Symmetry: D2
Subunit: 350 residues, 4 copies
């Protein structure tokens, strides 16, 4: 009809859909290694390492040159620096990924900014120049992108407010359509933070409301779900709760929230770990995939939950490199097995 979205290029759509399914491949998930300069500082400060360019290059090479990582990792999200970086030995980071058949991805948002006259609710910035950036990143080897939006739960303050949800959904939908116009699969990340002492049922209600708004906006903006991925938070108690919900509970409410809101043309839901321990992140995903088969792949896009022990094993010490790659492999295998519901553990409500 007149007034509807123009037809997407079949050739572009096929590439997006093929790459989205490759990223959401059974038994595999995403390594989120896209910490910005300031975020990697936090990661590095926790093990007392100077956040220099050489240390960042050493560490990202340690990750991406891990032999056999591609058995469990389908894609790696990079920060812009890393996409154009060489390892200490001189090899481009993207070439390390290609050697393992890992698809490079690129974080494209420009971080967070307070929405005026909210109680420090956040807009995600980055649409300006995004289309041109996506073209350059595709040329450099990226085939998917990531944009992080953030929402808070605070019942006393009415958070997340209508304005927060509307802004998050609008930014994610604009970003996703721009990515697809430039042949990048968009990872849509509406992260609801665990901050607070709310119950898991409150997280479930908020997650549903947010995802319903996000997917309506994706439709409004002509986003191709077949060529997109979702990166949501699992549904959990708030982080100030003294009792973490059981893995069975987390899996139940997470799957329920997704099935109530996510159309099944979407190929993959790649969870963020959002402060969970490495073992919880694996056990929670495993429990969801014992409830399968599902209408979309339920898998992982983990940063902290894939790297925490790796970092602690490396300690900034070059000599600890092999040990560090071994622990990364241990966690990659755990989460690949969890994708299949076959992880053995390591060291209806309406």
């Amino acid at each position: 009809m007149s007034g509807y979205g123009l037809p997407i290029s079949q050739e572009v759509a096929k590439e997006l859909a093929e790459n989205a399914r490759k990223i959401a491949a059974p038994g595999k998930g995403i390594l989120a290694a896209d910490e910005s300069t300031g975020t990697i500082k936090k990661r590095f400060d926790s093990i007392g390492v100077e956040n220099t360019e050489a240390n960042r290059a050493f560490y990202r090479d340690l990750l991406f040159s891990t032999k056999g990582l591609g058995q469990y990792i389908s894609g790696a999200i990079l920060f812009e620096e890393t996409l154009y970086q060489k390892s200490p030995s001189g090899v481009p980071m993207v070439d390390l990924l290609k050697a393992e058949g890992i698809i490079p991805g690129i974080k494209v948002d420009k971080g967070l900014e307070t929405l005026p006259l909210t109680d420090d609710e956040k807009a995600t910035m980055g649409l300006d120049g995004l289309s041109e950036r996506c073209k350059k990143y595709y040329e450099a080897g990226a085939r998917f992108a990531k944009w992080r939006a953030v929402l808070s739960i605070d019942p006393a303050k009415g958070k997340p407010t209508n304005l927060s949800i509307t802004e998050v959904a609008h930014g994610l939908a604009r970003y996703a359509a721009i990515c697809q116009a430039n042949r990048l699969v968009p990872i849509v990340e509406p992260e609801i933070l665990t901050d607070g002492s709310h119950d898991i049922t409150v997280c479930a209600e908020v997650t549903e409301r947010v995802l319903a708004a996000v997917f309506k906006a994706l439709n409004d903006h002509h986003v191709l779900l077949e060529g997109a991925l979702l990166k949501p938070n699992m549904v959990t108690h708030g982080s100030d709760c003294p009792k973490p919900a059981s893995h069975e509970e987390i899996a139940f409410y997470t799957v329920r929230s997704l099935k109530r809101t996510v159309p099944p043309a979407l190929p993959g839901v790649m969870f963020l770990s959002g402060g969970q321990s490495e073992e919880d992140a694996s056990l929670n995903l495993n429990e969801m995939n014992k409830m399968g088969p599902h209408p979309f792949q339920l898998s992982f896009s983990y940063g902290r939950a894939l790297q925490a022990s790796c970092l602690k094993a490396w300690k900034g010490v070059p000599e600890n490199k092999a040990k560090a790659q071994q622990v990364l492999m241990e966690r990659a295998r755990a989460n690949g097995e969890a994708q299949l519901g076959k992880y053995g553990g390591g060291a209806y409500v309406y």
Copy 2:
């Protein structure tokens, strides 16, 4: 949180979800026998039968007393008259349904009314007194309800307009929540009419936009998808097209439109036949279920496509009753087999 829907009664939710799954049972579908007085007149005029109460009672008894119908029919939608009617032999219509294990359902809308200052776009009326009606109907044996909204495609006139879609979605969401509060599974019927000469791709675009709006509104109104059913139109060419789309095309675009918009917590999509021939209705459903397995049951809620030949065989003649029940069984079996993708025929684009 404060400001969200109160929790639905677990006992009510369980009943709704159990009955919705019973209606969307594999190998079965819905007989839509809820023609109002004026609509059954049309049906009867086409075979030259006087639209008297006795003829209506005779015909509905002919349908519901068909021995073995419950093998293929999970539920029967009734008009209010029929819900409180006895067969010519004195048996309540609901008792005929119960004897076959067919769940009674009830049409609860009060028909269509033009939206002011539209080009005869239609609102569905009936919310006033609906909650009280649902209570009475549950007492009388109904366990699901139906509400029909209607949209037109007309590119030159911009139909369906924003106001049409907004009204359809609002009425369906209010109706569905009221039904569930009264322990009735709501069938949500946003019918996009085939009127016009538009292509199947136009029907697909409009269907997507409408369903995205409907399901956002269902979420806004706290409707439990686990205890609801969808009754949409298949995606087809307009009825003024000289070439009907292939069964393969209709199945592809119909499944695609659903997977792009319908969250998989919904248990069943029960298609309306919307003027299609009996054989097309079966072949189109069969073709969709050759593409399975699907995240929800794809089945039928057919009026014309289950009764056309039955009516033509009955001819208002009492003596043609057995013959008429035989042809009804033939079509019920065809469509039950089509639900499984096993109907043998009778007498990716982004």
Copy 3:
């Protein structure tokens, strides 16, 4: 364009706009005498009068036969019973109104019903058959209509919820367009109740949000603002507050909330009195009209604030009739003078 509202009949629009301006006439306002059977019982119980048909007829005749009332009263809202009623002396109620040049109006909503899964938030019912009712009421002499929606403020519960506001706005917009299609000026009444201990600034915020939503919906539904009236609550402290806001404060925040949301094509804002005393209702309106001139008429549509002392003077005693009509005239004059900012009293913040 294709997809926009069809043009309203110029002849119908002119009648609506002329009658809306007659109702919002300088120095005059509306007598709200449309208490349903159950609401007039409350009014009558407060003075110990049996709520019989004869007593209702006696009292409404006492009101409408008050000589000279038309100097201050432009229109009178009636309950359906009264529109078709005769005075104890045999004169039709509408003929009493016509003799004073008071325009008859008619309440057309069917009362309130809880929205499912809200904390007893209310939908207004009555759209079914409304168009046909409006035709009959126009024939009987009504030239404007009234539909009351209700919202609550409760910060701890997040009231009014998004669903409440969406439903209120949708019902009011549908009702208003149906009225105008039938040559009745719609009074749009989104009453925010005073219940609770919130501050006047909270009432101001909520009133703004509600009115912004209402007027967006009126536009979506093709409502002619030139032929409509608004009946909102004044902006005040909650009724559990021990200190009532000053008349200066109430006037400031009320005018501010209106000027921030109401397009000036609307001819009149006719305030409800919402539990205020007779004197407060007059002084608050007077204070607003000392701040004039305004882009729309600020006037009154008072029930309790025009009748409280009248009822107390009548006491159900026929002999107290003249005294009762005198006190009604006293309050009508007070509020007519308040419309002009000339009431002498009786017995910027961003």
Copy 4:
């Protein structure tokens, strides 16, 4: 309540409201001199002048050093280059404005970009870094800002589409709130282009729909209308029409469209001239202000309609400077008089 906008700083709000009223001063309007490098090239190519920095500095100095211009010009919108530029004689451009008491303003958008999968419908870019830019611009002397969004009318293509309107409104509301957080009055410019052969009544319908959406979004984002200005298109026939509407018609439909959508807390509507001749722009504004008094100031924010003859008189020739300033004064006086409805000409439908 919890969940509403935090209170705006009273000190910031007072400054914004005072400056907005100063800009919308009776008998005055805005000189729009904010042509970007590429737009001023077009302007300069039409008179055959090389678009060098020195020529731009010469011309902007010619404009802003016009003696007595502040009698008719309350504010001047600048391009960023000009805000930080000195005249050929060495005087900062902002100091020329201050000497005449003209308030400096700054264009802050980053231009237009196609919305993916639309028929070259445009988003306005520029939110990234906007808050930080506004701080710098305030320091440099700017007290108001401008952001231009663009919509097209094309009935056959359904333009402006829902996505276009939603994007325009979202960008304008985000921009306006960010400006106000940084003490800049935002000019909200949703320009509906005249392109096409549509009638004035089509322009009126589209303008209403767009403005209703814009002002709902401004409310959603907590924008202070008391400290904002609107810069809309007048309501006219499309530019391909052989007959331009009468000045009486343009004034009627323009005022009507505003009064149907713009809340009267907004202090000023400062029209763009949008391709009209200098004389039409003045006569159309004059005709609107013969229909006064209005609930907001109706005035001008003219680029082409204040400069066309000035440019043609200058011809890039330095010696033509005084003549050019004289013609600028002639047009400034014409439009200041038109603001009052006192321009003498130069060389109800529902």
